[PDB]
Amino acid sequence: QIELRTYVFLDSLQPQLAAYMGTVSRGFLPIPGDSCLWMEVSPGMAVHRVTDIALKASNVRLGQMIVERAFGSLALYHKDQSTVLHSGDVVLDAIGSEVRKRTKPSTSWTEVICAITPDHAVLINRQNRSGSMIQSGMSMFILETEPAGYVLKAANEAEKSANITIIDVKAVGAFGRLTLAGKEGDVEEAAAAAIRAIDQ
Amino acid sequence: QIELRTYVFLDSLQPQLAAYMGTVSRGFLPIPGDSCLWMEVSPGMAVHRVTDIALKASNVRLGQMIVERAFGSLALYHKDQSTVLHSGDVVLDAIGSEVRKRTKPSTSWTEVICAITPDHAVLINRQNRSGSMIQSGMSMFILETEPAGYVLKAANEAEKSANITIIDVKAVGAFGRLTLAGKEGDVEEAAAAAIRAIDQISNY
Amino acid sequence: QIELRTYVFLDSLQPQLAAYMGTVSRGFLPIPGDSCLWMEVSPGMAVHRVTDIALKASNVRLGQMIVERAFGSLALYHKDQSTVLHSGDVVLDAIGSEVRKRTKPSTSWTEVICAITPDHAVLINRQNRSGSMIQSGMSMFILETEPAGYVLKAANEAEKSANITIIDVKAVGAFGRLTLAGKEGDVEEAAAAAIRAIDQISNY
Amino acid sequence: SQVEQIELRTYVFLDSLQPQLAAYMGTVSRGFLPIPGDSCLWMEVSPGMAVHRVTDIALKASNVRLGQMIVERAFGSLALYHKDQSTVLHSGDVVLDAIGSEVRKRTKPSTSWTEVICAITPDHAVLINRQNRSGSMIQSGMSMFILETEPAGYVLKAANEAEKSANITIIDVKAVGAFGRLTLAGKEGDVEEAAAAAIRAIDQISNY
């Protein structure tokens, strides 16, 4: 009685999100245009069997896999949507679940902050930061969701919709966080897109 | 609905505590004699707004800033108390809170251990120890509080009161932990002063 | 108030478990054949006193010592079983506890997966793996228990019983995790012995 | 030990720190973070531990702050920051006088490698993003400018100038080591401008 908690499909990874996920991935690496499936199941120890099923079902490659007590996560990459989707479906059949059984994203913090200062920028740039640098004077959008993975979708759509800089995209754990920066207007556009993407 | 979890004001950083915080800070660095304000707010994501407010309110510098879900922390430094206090005043007005809304320190452990052995020292000295080294044969004082930031006040007041060695001051997370070492008598003076400091806060 | 959470005595560290614990230990190091006692105690801060008592009680050496709020753990090593058991005995008398007061292991996952793929093997090999490498095509046994420390007994017994490869043994935290690999038949042999070892502690 | 033993491997003065460089320097150094527009004096010396004397002298001569101090395998480096150009230069003057040296006595930079590479591949880009990168992310398709020098310190000056002259992205500026390594990326036109600026800066240090 494994259960699905998160399912997030990304048809095509935007440039920065691809570079970002490429930076933090601990398995195979994604490249721009790759399709990506992010899943989360409980209990966490079940992620291994799910991973094995996914990898044997197709040519999809494994980018990430994290085991915690309560939940486990994995990320799958391939240039073909169909390959990614097929592996998803085989997994879903094997555990007797389906997309709609996933928990929906609830956003618990959404905010734009203007003209960040140099001290604030250093701390942002230093602490577990895997994307690009924020420069003081920039504006910033921050977003938190639960479950965590859905933040990948917000990030991709945000990037599709505006000229901004990806700073960090935390998709692991119970809480998803997105941080992006740039000119205030672009940032406000990205924020709207991000929130919109979560609302579905 | 930002809430105040912790507020800890330090008038003047004692030499070891400033060296220690100098060691662990990921932002601007403190030096001996700086004032420091440490705050925790909930939810954690709120620490970014508070930080921005704080740094635009005055000439304070940001020393630390940490996000977790339930809460976040920040540490502010400046050579002038009024500068540090002003940023605090501005933050508390901005979020509609006040000092006496802070969560009261709960002390979960307090003890002195005499004549630490070599293996014990090595483990202490190695596992995320950012202060000075403990030597086997020293006595040691350990303190745990909840919420965490309060141990900074216990540490500054212990150093003020006694000739001891700061080994570690864990102020981030849900639980604060202080480790001091030295000669038994000194360690006992430090222990008493650390406990006084927390008690004051509890009774404020 | 100081209570015993876990008690795990290993009569003799098998070669791979010795080399694994030797890799991760942050104090004194174990060598093959050494006897080992792992204890968990609550609250976490009590582990310092328990450690001091153990080391002053005999010639055991301290290999690990971890503090978390709810509980803390320590590992004791010595070539002689009697020396290790004695330190445990002195600790249990000092805190008014005994072995049968420990929390029984609860197994939340046990599974053998055959013919692991290359991507899957790389993630395992990279993410805090401290033991040996898993190779794709190998079979794998994964075990999770709570409390954590009991996986050490499962690992040692698995090694005694079968020709396998130790990939990882997480004994710290609330949840213990064992990962072994090798040829299918051997891995199932190891899996069965691991389970026996845990059930045995459950029924003690 | 005698100041006669000291080699002044790098001496580089940055009048005004550009924004990306300032953000990067703050991220990467172990000292007091700079503000964009601050002046910075960077020095590198041999033997490594002589950097302590240079540091003590600099810090007691003015209100400069210590932005960086590091002792590497062989060499010691420091950065001094202040918003006032003259405050920084005064600390420099006091140091050079104290060690019996002067700007022109500084070891001249040799360029061991420099290149623009267009249209970086996805594979190439992700390796770059993954190998101890402290700056911003390179994206495949971008062009890239690469500069390696010895001594290492000079890439700092090259980096600041390149940022002045063009719109590009700073990936890394590794100014400590046997060799200094500057990496920046962006649109080919911009990158080419940055490249020329960087090379000019290095050449000027030579013909000075």
Next chain:
Amino acid sequence: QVEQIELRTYVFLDSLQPQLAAYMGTVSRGFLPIPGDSCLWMEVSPGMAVHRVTDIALKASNVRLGQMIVERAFGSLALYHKDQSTVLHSGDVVLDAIGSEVRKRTKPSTSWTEVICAITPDHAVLINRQNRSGSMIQSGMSMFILETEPAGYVLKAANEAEKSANITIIDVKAVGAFGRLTLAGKEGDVEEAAAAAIRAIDQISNY
């Protein structure tokens, strides 16, 4: 200009043996190899020239970048593909583009090799604890070690040792001023592995 480039290491692995593939996947920062994949490893001076070589190699064929790193002084990379000819072609294009050839590669100097039998428990833990990325050594095992200069060459030694013998890979540190190979297991197996490692280094020198 390419004339400045010293080709410190050129190594071609026809087929990555299982342990070495598991190892190179664990330690490398690029796309992981599948066992059996061919691999080309190159090391150049000056260090940053590895960028040009990398870009030429990747633009020339379907190889993947398994590794690329610039160390204190030197730059190295690993190219992977299932098919020998695809990897080889990448290397050919690179060597032409920089005006070099396999026989111009710097020749490995062997700065240290030996077999040590019956490793002690103290010695074993220290090996297990010092930045080890491979498998665990057990006391009582024999050990083969090899240090070369340039560093890249231990990679060929390792693959060939794995072909010849049933041993355990502890580490293959192919980046640095010196390259360092550490293999362990039963004495006779280790002696076979050792002999094959040395023949591999000699074969390189006499190509």
Next chain:
Amino acid sequence: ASQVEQIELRTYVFLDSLQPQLAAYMGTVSRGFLPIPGDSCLWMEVSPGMAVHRVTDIALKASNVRLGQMIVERAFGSLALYHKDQSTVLHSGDVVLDAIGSEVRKRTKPSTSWTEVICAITPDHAVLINRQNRSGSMIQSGMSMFILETEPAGYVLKAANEAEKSANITIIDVKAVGAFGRLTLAGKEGDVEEAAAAAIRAIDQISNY
């Protein structure tokens, strides 16, 4: 199969009795079996780096010393051997030196590339020092500081032990592995000048043995 004549004995250093801070520091910093204060320590450094394995194996098989450290760095290999009994440590050292056809007086001689005392460390300087990959104790601004850089690197260990014998100072770091060895002590000016003198004596005694 390499021969011992290829081995350069870069450092040979015998510590009769590890002083308290140095014992704590070496236990913190090393990757082997931690020392007890008072323990004897034999520290050796060799070229080529991987030759340290042969030295290690001979050392351990000759006596009951524990391996307190063994490391192969960019170029060089070092180890530390501990035992409470002076003679037990010396024996391993004797067996090792004979096995490689060497002797104490063949050790490469320490060159001092830098040494000085700086008084009244500023707050800025002090904080960088505490932040620079430090394993030892904290320096406080206002203290004086002694620094010693040698080549080969291992020799700073002997200087550190002797300095702690002579004065009440604070060990900040003793980096004995690398192209250069680096020692940093701090304290009250008088005490630091005393420590400095003893450290320098120790390096000179080595060259004159």
